A and B are shown apart, each in its own frame.
Chain A
Amino acid sequence: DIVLTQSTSSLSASLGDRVTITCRASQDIRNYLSWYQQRPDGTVKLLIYYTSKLHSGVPSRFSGSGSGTDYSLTITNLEQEDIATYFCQQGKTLPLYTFGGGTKLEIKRADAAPTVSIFPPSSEQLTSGGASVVCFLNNFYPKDINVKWKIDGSERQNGVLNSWTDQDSKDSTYSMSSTLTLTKDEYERHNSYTCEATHKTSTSPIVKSFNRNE
């Protein structure tokens, strides 16, 4: 019923600096707003209830404010454990509690374009009657990245699977795999397969392609 929107899905910050997350209600919640932190290991901890009331056991770095339909969570002097996901939830009436979609909080890195590779269906798979084309986009920052496939220069978003790794902990980049699956029949009919990556750093798309009629 009462909807809760967190503007942003992920944001990038840096050690020792200040981060703000905003929650917008769809109607007034009279200050009954809480925030939680979900660690990547999956643990969840309450941080702040009733807008600003800080839960004991929780660092003073975390403070919350807001009223009516707008609320924000602030982390001052962000430090390492804080790298996590943050949900707001309104508990105005029970059982109609709602949660924001989450805001992912990661450490800001220099911005790296992805290294990109495209792969034709293995002959072994061609005997199945199946045909998957795969594209890897490796080692990029920030997470935001749009990849779109094109067969014979015409887009396809049908039967694509996109999979993101965790921000690599040793190096703070991301990688993703994108798979387009077709029948072997469709596969033979067309000739050029393309995988087009668009990134903060692109500016135009990075593309990696191939042609089955050599």
Chain B
Amino acid sequence: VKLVESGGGLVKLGGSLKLSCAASGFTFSSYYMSWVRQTPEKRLELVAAINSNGGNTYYPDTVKGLFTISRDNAKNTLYLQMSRLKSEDTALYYCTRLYGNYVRIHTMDYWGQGTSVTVSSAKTTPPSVYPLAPGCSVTLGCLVKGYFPESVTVTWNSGSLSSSVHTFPALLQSGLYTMSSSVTVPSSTWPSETVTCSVAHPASSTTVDKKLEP
């Protein structure tokens, strides 16, 4: 039994998108199907569902205003038209087979692995990298803000200090992304010796190496 979604990706505000889900390992046309999305606040919600043949579809909201579900039983394919999209539609979208016993459909017995959909009108912007000397064993930091799209990579020194390093996941602020990174090193001695966070953002072809400064 399989469910593989695709169609996800970046799209601008107001944008449209058709997600697909290819099904196998069972008789597609025998089952109700549905899409479920997971917000980055990892709540789960049903987007839409549709019956065996395809004639009856079910929406919490809004019937064709936003989302439209459909299936091609000859092709073992399930579709979701998304249109007129907002930020808060940024989510991971799952294809799921619905299951009933006796004869309510109530649970979702099989799940695809999901397609990520990002909704942003942001322009590819490179990160500002700001070293973090404390104030005012020792811990240092590197702030990496104002970038798009995700992601970046931080490496400390080259980095000899592979461990004792934390990378904090990025968050969307003021339209762009912000993340940060720390490393802990021995007090005796620093800054007798230098420390660098090197940051890379391939989407803007930028590489920025930053010396830690008091």
Interface residues of A (CB under 8 A from B): 32, 34, 36, 38, 42-46, 49-50, 53, 55, 85, 87, 89, 91-92, 94-97, 99, 101-102, 115, 117-125, 128, 132, 134, 136, 138, 161, 163-165, 175-177, 179, 181, 210-212, 214
Q: Which of A136, A212, A214 has the most chain B CB within a 10 Å cutoff?
A: A136
Total of A-B residue pairs, C-beta within 8 Å:
140
- Contacting pair A179 B178 (CB below 8 A): yes
- Contacting pair B171 A163 (CB below 8 A): yes
**With known contacts A49-B99, A179-B180, A136–B166 Cβ distance under 8 A:** yes
Q: Which of B60, B99, B105, B132 has the most chain A CB within a 10 Å cutoff?
A: B132
User: Does B101 sit at the interface, judged by CB under 8 A?
Assistant: yes
- Contacting pair B184 A138 (CB below 8 A): yes
| Min CB–CB distance A112 → chain B (angstroms) | 14
Q: How far is the CA of A195 from the CA of B42 in the complex (A)?
A: 27
User: Does B104 sit at the interface, judged by CB under 8 A?
Assistant: yes
- Contacting pair B44 A32 (CB below 8 A): no
User: Does B106 sit at the interface, judged by CB under 8 A?
Assistant: yes
User: For B110, what are the chain A residues with a Cβ–Cβ distance below 8 Å?
Assistant: 46
- Contacting pair A134 B143 (CB below 8 A): yes
Further pairs besides A49-B107, A89-B108: 14, Cβ < 8 Å? A32-B106, A38-B42, A46-B109, A49-B101, A89-B44, A95-B58, A119-B134, A125-B128, A125-B130, A163-B169, A163-B180, A165-B169, A175-B182, A211-B136
| Min CB–CB distance B175 → chain A (angstroms) | 14
Task: Tell me how many residues of B have a C-beta within 8 Å of chain A.
Answer: 49
User: For B99, what are the chain A residues with a Cβ–Cβ distance below 8 Å?
Assistant: 49
User: For B59, what are the chain A residues with a Cβ–Cβ distance below 8 Å?
Assistant: 95
Q: How far is the CA of A110 from the CA of B182 in the complex (A)?
A: 23
Within 8 A of A (CB), among B167-183: 167-171, 173, 178-180, 182
Within 8 A of A (CB), among B92-133: 92, 94, 99, 101, 104-111, 113-114, 128, 130-133
| Min CB–CB distance A138 → chain B (angstroms) | 6
User: Does B149 sit at the interface, judged by CB under 8 A?
Assistant: no
Q: How far is the CA of A120 from the CA of B109 in the complex (A)?
A: 51
* Cβ-defined partner of B182 (8 Å) among A34, A44, A95, A136: A136
* Cβ-defined partner of A94 (8 Å) among B105, B130, B141: B105
